[PDB]
Design a protein around this ligand. Structure first.
Ligand SMILES: Nc1nc2c(ncn2[C@@H]2O[C@H](COP(=O)(O)OP(=O)(O)O)[C@@H](O)[C@H]2O)c(=O)[nH]1
Lengths: 218, 26, 369
């Protein structure tokens, strides 16, 4: 009965669908303005290096589901996602002289492949399964568990919890190559670094826990 | 501190009791 | 961020109108530009509803259609007439460009086979002049004709930001094979399908590819190699589609290797099986890439129009496109020694020679230098 009167009438499920939608279109125009700060400037933009804490307002009938420590995890994945959209768009908006372009495809590929992995293979696989699960909610408690078994797993597949200084930092430091090379528009000293860190990336990730092989091809 | 008489189903009680209290307020 | 369309000559006005027919058929917009009751962000391709169309004899034919509520043969001949109405047409562009909030691109439908090729040559040099931050993509159509063609190439080689080839001969082949027709009014039915499905990710928002610059620049490695060819087999899992796409019977083009592949999936396919399909494509190795740069294949999921079954489109950057140029090129050398300055024609012949000579070197293990 409770789940029945909770689909509408304090529609907790409807609110949940919007949550994972207003981040993870609309949010494309929002970030592009940030590329070219102030704390009030953003609000009118939204209503239209690692910060931008985002929150939301939830009514009491759904407060018990989307807890306070649940907002931060949803915020955690949003921060990291933008840095990927950043590097992906920074190397995209533009269009031994031509030798730079060979450093573009050798790089614009790699960040693009990673982005194809986090969003499609993870942020859409578990998402497609989660919706098929909540529509069979039959309990006050288990709806928390099926939900809590969606963040604590999406925070693991997207490598952000542990093994950060062992694996995650590698993707982080090579992301700085997406910033340095973007501004300049020394060249030989980039591939010596790039061919090293990229090989450092594969020769470290080679330990593969098993789902990492979906990107290990490149 | 608990009678095992109703233990094999106790979980289905609490999860029904508390869930019912949140219904009368709505 | 919107994209404005321009239809030139009989051809361009024909292909655009039919494309606007099906696009209005897919969307929930009645022919009378009035919304039908019966999820889609349509501000990019529609203005609140009137399309952002710039049409340029066939005008009577367009008006005679019930869609009236929706708004010589020399190349040098077209070039002269364009300067005559320079400010005449550019006011229509400027009233809409500045009339558009944030313009994003410039799509062009024109045939380089008479006057539209000359006028189209005029727009490119002119559009690069005024607007330096605006994308220019051209959906040019290919087949005294060698002359008009080769000039438009010279203009298209350095002006346009991208290019999508559509040759009539290969399209003529599909006309008989899978349709059994032998007609102009029928071949364009596929062209509209090629056009509409090309921009499906932009009209139906998803997670990836929310801007046209997001799609193209993944393919184009360098601004010189900005020529693309498409594929559309469905006329079934994700693996069945892509394998049907690499067959040369379907490619709309009449050693060699690819540069990059982008795929569009519009069905209800599951995102669980796409990453494995790429593996079987690599293991079985149905295609080769450049030996220098590590090339990748991309594929995007979308949503078919509910107001309208698994279909798909393929965009390719294949170095075999060089052969198409060499034919007309040979045809030019044919009529040059066969028959007031006649000097610009040699300048066009020099630059198009450069691009071809880059294709042949683009597929070598030493593309550097
Ligand atoms: N595939 C295809 N080609 C067309 C169509 N209409 C015209 N063409 C091509 O366009 C060329 C003639 O263009 P033309 O009418 O002279 O352009 P204009 O000089 O600007 O009016 C011919 O070679 C045709 O092959 C069409 O509907 N489909």
């Amino acid at each position: 009965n409770l789940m029945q009167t909770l689909k509408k009438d304090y529609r907790l499920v409807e609110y949940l669908q919007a949550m994972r939608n207003f981040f993870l279109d609309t949010m494309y125009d929002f970030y592009t303005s940030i590329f070219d700060q102030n704390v009030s400037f953003l609000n009118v933009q939204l209503q239209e290096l690692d910060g931008l804490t985002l929150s939301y307002k939830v009514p009491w009938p759904v407060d018990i589901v989307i807890s306070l420590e649940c907002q931060k995890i949803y915020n955690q994945v949003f921060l990291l996602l933008l840095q990927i959209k950043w590097a992906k768009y920074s190397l995209d908006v533009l269009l031994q002289i031509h030798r730079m372009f060979l450093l573009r495809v050798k790089l614009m590929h790699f960040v693009n492949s990673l982005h194809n992995y986090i969003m499609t293979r993870i942020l859409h696989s578990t998402g497609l399964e989660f919706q098929h699960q909540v529509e069979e909610a039959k309990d006050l408690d288990q709806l928390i568990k099926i939900h809590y078994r969606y963040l604590s797993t999406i925070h693991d597949r997207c490598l952000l919890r542990e093994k950060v200084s062992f694996v995650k930092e590698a993707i982080m430091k090579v992301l700085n190559l997406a910033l340095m090379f973007a501004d300049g528009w020394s060249i030989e000293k980039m591939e010596s670094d790039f061919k090293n860190c990229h090989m450092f990336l594969v020769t470290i990730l080679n330990k593969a826990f098993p789902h990492l092989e979906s990107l290990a091809l490149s | 501190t608990m009678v095992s008489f109703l233990k094999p189903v106790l979980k289905q009680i609490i999860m029904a009791g508390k869930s019912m209290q949140l219904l009368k307020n709505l | 961020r919107e994209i404005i369309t321009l239809q030139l000559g009989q051809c361009g006005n024909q292909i655009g109108f039919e494309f606007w027919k099906q696009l209005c058929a897919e969307h929930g917009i009645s022919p009378e530009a009035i919304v039908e009751e019966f999820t889609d962000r349509k501000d990019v391709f529609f203005y609140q509803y009137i399309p952002r169309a710039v049409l340029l004899r066939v005008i009577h034919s367009i008006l005679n259609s019930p869609y009236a509520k929706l708004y010589g043969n020399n190349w040098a001949s077209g070039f002269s007439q364009g300067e005559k109405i320079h400010e005449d047409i550019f006011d229509i562009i400027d009233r809409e460009a500045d009339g558009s909030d944030s313009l994003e691109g410039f799509v062009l439908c024109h045939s380089i086979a008479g006057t539209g090729s000359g006028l189209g040559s005029y727009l490119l040099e002119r559009l690069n002049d005024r607007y330096p931050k605006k994308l220019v993509q051209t959906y040019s159509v290919f087949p005294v004709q060698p002359y008009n063609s080769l000039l438009t190439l010279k203009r298209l080689t350095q002006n346009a930001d991208c290019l999508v080839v559509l040759d009539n001969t290969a399209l003529n082949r599909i006309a008989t094979d899978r349709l059994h027709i032998q007609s102009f009014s029928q071949i364009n039915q596929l062209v509209s399908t090629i056009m509409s499905a090309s921009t499906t990710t932009l009209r139906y928002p998803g997670y990836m590819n929310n801007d046209l610059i997001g799609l193209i620049a993944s393919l184009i490695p360098t601004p010189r190699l900005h020529f693309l060819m498409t594929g559309y087999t469905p006329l079934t899992t994700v693996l069945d589609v892509m394998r049907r796409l690499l067959q040369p019977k379907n490619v709309m083009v009449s050693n060699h290797c690819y540069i990059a592949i982008l795929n569009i999936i519009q069905g209800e396919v599951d995102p669980t099986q796409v990453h494995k399909s790429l593996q079987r494509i690599r293991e079985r190795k149905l295609a080769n890439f450049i030996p220098w740069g590590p090339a990748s294949i991309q594929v995007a999921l979308s949503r078919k129009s509910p107001y309208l079954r698994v279909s798909g489109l393929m965009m390719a950057n294949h170095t075999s496109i060089s052969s198409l140029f060499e034919r007309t090129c040979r045809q030019y050398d044919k009529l040059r020694k066969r028959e007031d300055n006649f000097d610009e024609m040699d300048t066009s012949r020099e630059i198009v020679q450069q691009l071809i000579d880059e294709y042949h070197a683009a597929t070598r293990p030493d593309y550097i230098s």
